[PDB]
Amino acid sequence: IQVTQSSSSFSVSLGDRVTITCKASEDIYNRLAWYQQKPGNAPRLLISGATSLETGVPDRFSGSGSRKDYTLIITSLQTEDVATYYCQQYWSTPLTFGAGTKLELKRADAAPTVSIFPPSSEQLTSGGASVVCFLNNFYPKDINVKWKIDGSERQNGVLNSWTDQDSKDSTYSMSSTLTLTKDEYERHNSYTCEATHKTSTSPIVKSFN
């Protein structure tokens, strides 16, 4: 039996009434539980038997549905409610869990602040050459980065790392690194990282020679 949550990510504002669905591949007769999970911690049981709230779980939470369609509802969404939610059926084995629905906080759109950095003399002595580009404090989270070397787009050798939504300002940040050998880095002159974000029609371009 499989459980599908469909919604992978949802942008919400405090006080909003969020609904997260879970559809079973077959009648599970209310044998469904909901869990909440935050980064680094184990899941926490919120509801069992499709509608029974566990002790400690705030009244804001409630569950409903039947047969193959089940829902988890959060009345006045609070900051503490930002997390990932999972449904799980236990009508038959193997026990199965939905893919999880992550909620994120909505805030004002913000263009990323982009900075580019050439390889340090210290790394060059090691035979390596990393070009780093930081794209900080932007929103919404969707962003694309493109690297160009003497005008040609470069895909291989690019490593990207994304932060989770900031708990202080609700923005996202990203770091993109292009690593080459010292020899190759020295063979070319112009290095550019281009960020495409909804906050601008033209990509934000930072470069150096």
Binding site: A42, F117, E122, N160
Partner: protein, 213 residues
Amino acid sequence: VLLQQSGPELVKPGASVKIPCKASGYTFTDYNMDWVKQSHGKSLEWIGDINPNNGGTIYNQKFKGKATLTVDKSSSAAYMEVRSLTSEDTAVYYCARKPYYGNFAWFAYWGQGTLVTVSAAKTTPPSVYPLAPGSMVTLGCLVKGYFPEPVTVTWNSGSLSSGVHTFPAVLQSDLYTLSSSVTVPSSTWPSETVTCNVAHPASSTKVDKKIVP
């Protein structure tokens, strides 16, 4: 009710690891114990169930052979052994207890989970490189080629935090790399010293890299 699991596990490919789940706060043999697998930023996957009273097991077929569940009642502990480890086995493995009436297979009690990282890399210290620009200025620090995780990054011995972004490490090769940025007023740098401090517990290394123009 307490389910105690051991800390991070580093294991070589092909080897086996035995993950413990020490229970206390209840009659160990009166509740079944299950195990769940969770891969980095992924969903939860059920592995199996064991009756501590008779040792009886029920497995998610997918994990047969790969995982073996056992218990040691005399010591109120449950164990899961994972064998012939590969890269796909890297994940957090949780034990979780069922209710007295096991039929209602939901989990109100979970262990903290044990991260099992499968790698053949050897302990390796990070190389720490300064990132200097080339009325707010952004500086940075690249920390590359280290193993295993984690590394600790601070700026000016922790006196700077507001304008700092330290990114999640990423596996570049079989070694990890991460970067950290810090933004400060143009009047404080380079007029005043800005340094990133990087510690790597695994190799007992501590490095300070001053950022210079």
